[PDB]
Amino acid sequence: GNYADELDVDVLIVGAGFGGIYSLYEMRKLGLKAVIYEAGNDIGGTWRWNCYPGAGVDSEVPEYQLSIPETWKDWTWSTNYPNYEDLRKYFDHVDKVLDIKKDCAFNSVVVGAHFHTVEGRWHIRTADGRTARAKYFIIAAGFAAKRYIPEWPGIEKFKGIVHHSSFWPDEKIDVRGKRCAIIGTGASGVQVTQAWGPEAGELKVFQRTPNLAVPMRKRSLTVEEQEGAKAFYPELFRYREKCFAGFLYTWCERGVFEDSEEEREQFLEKLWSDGGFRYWVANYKDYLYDAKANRVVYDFWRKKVRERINDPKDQELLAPSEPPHPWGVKRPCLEYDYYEQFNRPNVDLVDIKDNSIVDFTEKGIKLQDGTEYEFDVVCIATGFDITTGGMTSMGLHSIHGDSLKEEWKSGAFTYLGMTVSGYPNMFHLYGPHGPTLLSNGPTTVEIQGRWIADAIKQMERQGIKYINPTAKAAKEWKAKINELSDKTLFPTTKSTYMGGSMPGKVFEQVNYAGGEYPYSKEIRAVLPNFNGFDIVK
Numbered sequence: 448g449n450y451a452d453e454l455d456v457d458v459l460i461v462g463a464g465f466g467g468i469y470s471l472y473e474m475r476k477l478g479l480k481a482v483i484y485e486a487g488n489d490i491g492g493t494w495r496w497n498c499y500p501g502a503g504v505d506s507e508v509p510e511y512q513l514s515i516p517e518t519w520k521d522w523t524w525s526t527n528y529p530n531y532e533d534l535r536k537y538f539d540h541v542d543k544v545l546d547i548k549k550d551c552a553f554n555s556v557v558v559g560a561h562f563h564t565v566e567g568r569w570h571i572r573t574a575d576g577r578t579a580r581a582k583y584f585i586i587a588a589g590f591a592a593k594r595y596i597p598e599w600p601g602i603e604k605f606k607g608i609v610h611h612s613s614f615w616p617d618e619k620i621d622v623r624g625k626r627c628a629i630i631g632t633g634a635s636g637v638q639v640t641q642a643w644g645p646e647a648g649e650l651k652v653f654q655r656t657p658n659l660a661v662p663m664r665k666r667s668l669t670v671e672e673q674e675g676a677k678a679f680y681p682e683l684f685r686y687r688e689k690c691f692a693g694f695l696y697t698w699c700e701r702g703v704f705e706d707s708e709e710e711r712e713q714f715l716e717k718l719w720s721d722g723g724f725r726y727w728v729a730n731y732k733d734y735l736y737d738a739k740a741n742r743v744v745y746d747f748w749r750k751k752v753r754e755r756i757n758d759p760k761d762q763e764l765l766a767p768s769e770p771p772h773p774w775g776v777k778r779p780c781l782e783y784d785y786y787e788q789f790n791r792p793n794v795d796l797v798d799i800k801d802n803s804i805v806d807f808t809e810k811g812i813k814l815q816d817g818t819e820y821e822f823d824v825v826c827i828a829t830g831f832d833i834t835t836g837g838m839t840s841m842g843l844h845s846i847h848g849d850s851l852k853e854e855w856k857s858g859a860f861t862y863l864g865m866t867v868s869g870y871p872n873m874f875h876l877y878g879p880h881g882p883t884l885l886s887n888g889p890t891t892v893e894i895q896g897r898w899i900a901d902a903i904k905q906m907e908r909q910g911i912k913y914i915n916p917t918a919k920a921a922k923e924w925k926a927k928i929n930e931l932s933d934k935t936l937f938p939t940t941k942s943t944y945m946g947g948s949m950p951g952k953v954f955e956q957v958n959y960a961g962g963e964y965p966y967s968k969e970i971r972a973v974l975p976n977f978n979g980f981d982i983v984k
């Protein structure tokens with residue numbers, strides 16, 4: 448049925464993660480024939496494929512789920528910060544309540560897409576030779592696309608167990624008493640470090656740049672306290688769409704230097720205590736916008752983290768006097784006992800800032816000054832390539848015949864962070880030029896989801912064949928993306944530290960930095976007239 452060799456649908460969705468599950472939901476309400484092409488065999492996105500030791504949410508319950516009444520009605524969590532196993536069981540519950548799988552074609556890897564302007568339809572080709580033709584094309588393909596491993600020829604030779612964090616196997620590797628390595632101190636590294644520290648015989652963490660990690664206030668939830676709150680879950684889900692990063696909190700109405708030295712200490716203690724990303728996006732409104740303001744947030748962070756690390760050498764490495772970059776310039780890691788792990792005599796932080804990893808060997812890995820380390824298990828928690836999402840990665844072709852990969856070689860150009868000029872009736876959720884990485888995933892998805900479902904609703908009512916963003920509209924959006932980011936302390940091409948900079952492409956801000964509320968207003972302005980689109984009946 449959904450696996451037919453030439454598939455006729457109104458809507459083709461790529462991905463069965465949050466983005467694809469919510470898009471499918473919205474399409475069913477419009478009464479359109481829709482199908483998800485999913486590369487994998489189950490729904491959940493990153494929560495199925497890209498799981499690793501001690502992986503779980505950094506968003507607090509009930510922030511990280513769908514606002515769909517019927518999905519959370521009889522659902523509760525065991526804890527306020529669930530892990531990947533809890534999330535997997537949540538997606539089973541969403542499938543049991545909505546029957547998502549009925550409209551999925553699994554092991555469907557999209558390798559090509561071209562829009563036939565005369566037909567007014569996408570032809571969407573899978574790796575295994577099937578093709579769907581659809582009026583509307585929705586890409587819920589995620590941002591954790593293109594796992595980044597640096598140029599280490601040796602990996603082939605290494606005798607031990609090695610994987611990138613996002614490719615860690617389902618079947619857990621017993622690391623108890625083994626020599627393990629973690630390369631990277633992003634959320635992935637930090638999460639794995641907390642998981643391996645307690646059990647590994649020896650463990651080495653290879654740190655170029657330290658994580659500016661903030662405390663996770665994890666606790667058990669009862670079914671009772673949750674069922675009690677659900678009176679106002681609807682209001683809560685609406686409140687996150689009013690909040691800068693789409694959590695149940697946003698910026699303090701005050702800037703750093705409206706408060707005294709005592710008032711700051713107390714206010715910052717309160718955010719630290721309360722936990723989550725309050726320190727990141729419930730802090731003084733100007734700390735991401737002014738250097739002196741940033742430094743005050745940094746120093747307090749430095750004080751709190753130093754209290755937890757015994758060795759003065761590790762103290763300096765894990766929380767330096769001089770910031771490696773402005774505080775909160777990248778989504779920090781929500782940690783539980785990261786800093787405690789480096790107090791263990793089996794754990795060892797290695798400074799590679801000036802002494803790069805040259806290559807892997809048979810035994811383990813080797814550095815610039817010729818230092819070698821022998822290992823049994825290595826997790827490569829290096830970056831992703833977020834120059835763009837998995838949008839360039841599925842052979843999307845414009846109506847000018849060029850690939851999106853090609854048209855985006857000098858930098859990404861979307862309109863409203865949901866559409867691309869030369870890709871008519873093509874929509875993306877949780878991708879470039881959306882709140883995306885500066886946001887609660889499910890919040891941004893629902894804002895964007897509702898806009899795509901309205902956009903599609905309007906095209907059906909007004910009798911529109913296709914809409915296509917103008918280069919003028921896309922350039923103006925790019926100008927906006929850059930105007931919001933350039934006010935901030937976010938890295939620029941002139942910055943000494945440019946997190947996730949790559950040889951291939953130029954470095955640029957990829958997310959909308961204006962907040963969920965101003966974003967919602969921007970995208971809402973353009974309906975129902977489709978301002979900035981070529982309209983064809």
Ligand SMILES: Cc1cc2nc3c(=O)[nH]c(=O)nc-3n(C[C@H](O)[C@H](O)[C@H](O)COP(=O)(O)OP(=O)(O)OC[C@H]3O[C@@H](n4cnc5c(N)ncnc54)[C@H](O)[C@@H]3O)c2cc1C
Pocket residue numbers: 461462463464465466467484485486487491492493494496497498502503504505506511555556557558587588589590591837840841876877886887888889
């Ligand atoms: C361990 C972990 C924890 C996280 N915790 C949080 C958190 O607490 N808060 C937060 O805000 N964000 C968090 N994130 C980020 C997370 O990626 C997003 O919040 C969200 O899960 C993305 O949903 P999505 O559906 O947009 O993407 P994904 O979940 O990545 O789904 C994309 C889907 O597209 C499919 N696909 C890709 N390419 C193709 C193709 N060519 N053809 C067909 N199918 C294709 C994939 O197989 C996948 O099913 C976390 C990520 C990880 C890995």
Ligand SMILES: NC(=O)c1ccc[n+]([C@@H]2O[C@H](COP(=O)([O-])OP(=O)(O)OC[C@H]3O[C@@H](n4cnc5c(N)ncnc54)[C@H](OP(=O)(O)O)[C@@H]3O)[C@@H](O)[C@H]2O)c1
Pocket residue numbers: 503505591597612630631632633634635636638653655656777778799804828829830831884946947
């Ligand atoms: N837990 C989560 O919520 C989660 C999970 C997955 C992804 N994400 C998102 O997607 C991104 C990926 O997160 P991540 O934790 O996997 O990794 P990351 O934050 O992208 O950082 C990877 C780490 O690897 C280091 N590194 C990169 N190349 C290296 C090299 N050649 N040699 C040595 N070290 C190297 C980086 O150092 P430098 O800092 O010096 O470059 C960095 O410490 C994040 O920005 C995050 O927002 C989030």
